[PDB]
Amino acid sequence: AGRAALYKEVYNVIASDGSYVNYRHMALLVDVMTTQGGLTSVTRHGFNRSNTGALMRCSFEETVEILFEAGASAELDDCRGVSENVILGQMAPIGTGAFDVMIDEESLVKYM
Amino acid sequence: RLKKVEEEENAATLQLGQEFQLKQINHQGEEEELIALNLSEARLVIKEALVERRRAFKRSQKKETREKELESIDVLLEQTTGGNNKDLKNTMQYLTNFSRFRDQETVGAVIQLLKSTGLHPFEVAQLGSLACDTADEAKTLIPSLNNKISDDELERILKELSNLETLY
Amino acid sequence: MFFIKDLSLNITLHPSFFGPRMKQYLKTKLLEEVEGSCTGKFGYILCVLDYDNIDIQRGRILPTDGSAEFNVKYRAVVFKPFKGEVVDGTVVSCSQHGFEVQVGPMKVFVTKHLMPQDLTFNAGSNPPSYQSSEDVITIKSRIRVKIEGCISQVSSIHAIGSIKEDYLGAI
Amino acid sequence: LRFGEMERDCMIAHGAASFLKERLMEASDAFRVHICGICGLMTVIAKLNHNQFECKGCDNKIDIYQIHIPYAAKLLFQELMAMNIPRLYTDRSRD
Amino acid sequence: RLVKALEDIMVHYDNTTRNSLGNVIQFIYGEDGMDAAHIEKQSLDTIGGSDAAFEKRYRVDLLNTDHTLDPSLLESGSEILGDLKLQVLLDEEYKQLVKDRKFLREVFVDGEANWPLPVNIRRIIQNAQQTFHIDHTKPSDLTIKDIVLGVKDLQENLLVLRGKNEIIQNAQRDAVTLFCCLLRSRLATRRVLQEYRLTKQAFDWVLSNIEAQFLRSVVHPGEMVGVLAAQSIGEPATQMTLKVTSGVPRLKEILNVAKNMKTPSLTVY
Amino acid sequence: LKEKAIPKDQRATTPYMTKYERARILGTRALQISMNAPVFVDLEGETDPLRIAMKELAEKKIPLVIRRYLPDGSFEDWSVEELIVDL
Amino acid sequence: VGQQYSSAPLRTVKEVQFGLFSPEEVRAISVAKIRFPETMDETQTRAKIGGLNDPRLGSIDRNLKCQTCQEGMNECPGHFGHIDLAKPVFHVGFIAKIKKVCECVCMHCGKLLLDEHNELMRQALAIKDSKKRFAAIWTLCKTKMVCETDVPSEDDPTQLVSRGGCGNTQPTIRKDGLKLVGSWKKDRATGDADEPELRVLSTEEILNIFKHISVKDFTSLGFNEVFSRPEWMILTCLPVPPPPVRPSISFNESQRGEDDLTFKLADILKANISLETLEHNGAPHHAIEEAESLLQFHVATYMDNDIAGQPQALQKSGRPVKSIRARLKGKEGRIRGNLMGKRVDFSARTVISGDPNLELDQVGVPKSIAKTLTYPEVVTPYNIDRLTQLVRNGPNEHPGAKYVIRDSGDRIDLRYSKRAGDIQLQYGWKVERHIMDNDPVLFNRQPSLHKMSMMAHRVKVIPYSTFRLNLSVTSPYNADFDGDEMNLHVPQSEETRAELSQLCAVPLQIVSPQSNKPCMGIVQDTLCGIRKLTLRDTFIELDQVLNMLYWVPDWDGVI
DNA sequence: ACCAAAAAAAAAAATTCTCCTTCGAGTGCTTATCGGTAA
DNA sequence: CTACCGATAAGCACTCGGATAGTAGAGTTTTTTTTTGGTT
RNA sequence: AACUAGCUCUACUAUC
Ligand SMILES: [Mg+2]
Ligand SMILES: [Mg+2]
């Protein structure tokens, strides 16, 4: 009921003027905010302090202290986030990157 | 990663390291022991491999006297492109010297006799280290040979095969 | 020593070789780099096993360029030198301090002090002559010398073994 | 000119990941370094002429790989462990 | 703040939606799988009108004189009367339509007809009419069995979840229910014959075009939809000038709660 | 943990090659034939590599196979020809 | 072409591990044992003294040492030395956590207050997310100021067995800025049985305690044994960063351009040597503590400038000294200005005007700026003629080039070009040339608000330096023709230019997904014109209609 | 013999109030503390 | 009667603050002394 | 073809 009401409220706010935008965006927003067992504001400390990769977290409003916490907890990141690649300077699994480009031999043989 | 050493400096007893793990994985996923064969067994396997590339190279063409074997392996090399594989020759020069028995038939028969026994290849492989068949020298060299079992048990096993074999 | 085991190698193929003959090209290449290999871990790789039936399953195109990478698994015949072993070999090079034995592929160098005391050798001034037990100075000149120090600093294995021990020396 | 946050975000929306990488790398740092997987650190010393790449301390003449990263990132790393905190690997470890 | 919150979230090759941790947020993106492009303010038809008007628009019975159709529309328009098979099938269709009417009255209390939907049916109907020089005089060759089967066949062939288990089948039926109901509404037999007049050839043409367009309408698997949504919602936020709070401060209030509303009034019926 | 792959049957991925994949394949072959790769489709004196690649795609003799991932980690694959291009 | 080729395998990076430095290993990886606090000009000529500033690490200028690796300067990644401290010191970032830990463990025995006999810590162990259990343990061990030895009374029927190490009582702990103290109230052996003992804790005591905790207890507290063990929390052997993080800018006349951090390091070295010499001699034991305080202060400031504002750490100039945290803090510090967003190459920027003639997808590009940028290709059996023509042309007319990159890394300038009419450009080579027409290009107008504001474009070449575009594309860019500017980007490889020609071409952007209706359109001029045309009460004569039918490029040719 | 440049060595550092000053925003984390309550 | 929470508030302690551009202007230790070489 | 521009500190502007 909370997510329903929140979507209603935000849709009202946007439709107040310059309406509109497709429902799917707002739905995605309210859900990705609420899929936690509760709800969380998008603050420096609302969502960012949650189980998530290290770097992408430290790329927002929390410069170094978060790294200190990570090192102390000595946790690790698998770097499947976009940021992790960007900082790492490698193609992130994005768009064209969302798949590998693989090679075959038998087709090469068949058509010479 | 805390240096993960798990290694021991090599000794006459051949204490196996981690990267030479006693039980090795396989691509199929089976778990088996560190595949090692004596000085005798390897030579025939090499000959089979060589004759396999013999067929392969007669296929490429249409597009016991160690020196001639060396030149044959050289021919295997030059059939593709000019052979500069000198180290393979020099090791191969010593490859027949690796094998305990020089003659093909003697080493082969030693192999077929040992394969039924299922004895550790280390025991018979230690033979070809030096040009000596007297056991006392080996017992002096390697104490583990004495420790694992007495000498006379070694020869009561050995004389079954040493009869057919003629050393260098 | 004689350990034969399947080995995995990473191979990068230049895109210009993308022809139906590539499989043959890959097999040839693997033949060059694999044969005569002398690595630190496996010692020196002497030859492959089962040349045919090697698995080349597929290949990944590098994102930056047409280069394609292949991972292949192959069984091979490889020798691993190990310390504590006594090997007789040719004295290819002769030095005043001590004779240098070339045991086939790997090389053994020994000084005057390592030389056995039971088998007294006149090795200090020059390579030891014929004396008490037996010793030789020729190119063939096989001399029984132990291996106790294995070095993989260079793309080869160098072995050193002290000879002042129970039954060490030429006979 | 300056490439900024929102520009990158719009690229992401488009998803032209390869162009993103090329523009951020070749028009920028485009640096290369080797590492010790046993270290996972930024410390290996090389001798290009001598073809030696040993990681002293980790005394391993095998565990060597070279990685293309932005100079800025590696810089970050130098002050980071200078700040006394960051290992690196080159493969998965949990599957 | 918004863009820095939903970067990773995106749609993978399972028509699902995960962050860069694998947390699912939308099992089917937008609950439709239809890309944000392929939407029109297309007009639904069943919900509106009166019961009598709905009946006249859709109800038909050969064995009864009132809602029967004129034989002149059909080549086999006379002897078609009397068959029990056809009457049974028509009654089944009518029951399906009335069930859909109940459903739509349930889903939207207001009953507003216009809604954002995937690929339009109007335009393809008009261009099909043009592409065959369909006249107002000739009867129709296609028979009742033809259309009454083809409608179900098309609605079945539409596929959004390339699955094989039971749960996927359930979702796939669920994910397309509104569109199939709308399609059923637009392609009523009475409507088709009395106004649309299509030939069997053109009928097959429109069926194939519908299927092709619907497949064209799937979300492309592999876009970073979260960033798109965030940037989209952000865009108008700047482009706006201004006793109840509203505007950018209110926006911040909800987006950053902040349990303090200054207009916490509530509505009671 | 069991070999993390799948047979070419029972594949649940969409049978339509997506636009991202389209652009990726096009760019890859553009770079490929750009630096003198072997060509397959007959030329018409057309010099541009990218248009050569597009002609190849239309003619459907592309010697590539596409890899495909799932969030679990297990992967899946396809060959270009068995896909159908509409977009 | 090989960036001084390295015969080492290359691979991507799939995973990053975070952890501290164990003092022994950081000392192991070191190269220098820096003693001298001076930096340059030994006595005082040149060849910086073997103290700071490369005894045996990163080179300085045109001296290819790289610690004798000869890897020039551009290749030199740097190398590390290490410093040694007489006494343990804290770590300003690592203060609250260490305080919580100290409260959590029982010093004087080195044990946990709570142990698996109450339910509570058992459920705390049960909630193994990563860290929240640490908070649970911390909030459960706040009480029980006294170490116990025989806790379990009712889990066993009535008896009680031994688990605790010491019978002592743990003092309450507070902190004051850089320092923390313990309060031994204890209700006994104290002032009038109530007045506590206020004693400042000694770091090394804490560090001994920290070793004495059992290994599994780290896991209990979330410390990763192999990567983060609590005794490493304290700083003992501070590592030294390399030169290339502290350049010698030499600001424009003769200065040495010594950075803030290197002065900080020299100061901390002075502090260390001062404390050493003080303690080594007769320690009056009323100034050695002050030396300790000063040394910890300096290390604190160097690690971070902006602790609670009792100090300020002013430099010898007046501006406060700048430390690592401030160096890489957000908003243009090292992340959002130097890592996440960057300055790029191959770009241009100017003012713009309309054009009623260029088609929608192209972009008006100025001839001069067209010559300025460039683009490489690869020599093919197909491009040889055109490339030959261009390289013949030279760098001073439109369809030309500026560089020739052959098989080897041989940058050949065409401005000098002593052998212009010579080279023949065999296959597999790279030639950087100008921008001819129909080249993909990126066009963008910051600020960017949606998917648009940057798309692809074809290129026409136009005099009168400015940018030109079509009135239609105006509104999505939300740009005027008064004085506004956009930014230009050009791909560098065939891959990328392809990658842009299918997801950023304004042909492919007509319908905005944002509002499910097209974001394109036509604007005031054309709109007014068409309205003034397409109304019943108008007409047209013969000449003008003919000119119109000629105007439309796609005219069938039928009147 | 005069002295002037300059390099080297050390510290100017006190007046005083809390005004710092408007940055106020919120939010989270610590700590006092009445206040009740079951044994 | 008595610790035993305990919820409440008060405090106190946090760190955050649009995207690019282009300028030009001033200062990036001070003072004091001692030393010794240029000077007549 | 001898291979480097280059830091911070405040004021003013340019679009939005
Ligand atoms: Mg996480
Ligand atoms: Mg304007």
Ligand SMILES: [Zn+2]
């Ligand atoms: Zn290492």
Ligand SMILES: [Zn+2]
């Ligand atoms: Zn170096």
Ligand SMILES: [Zn+2]
């Ligand atoms: Zn205790």
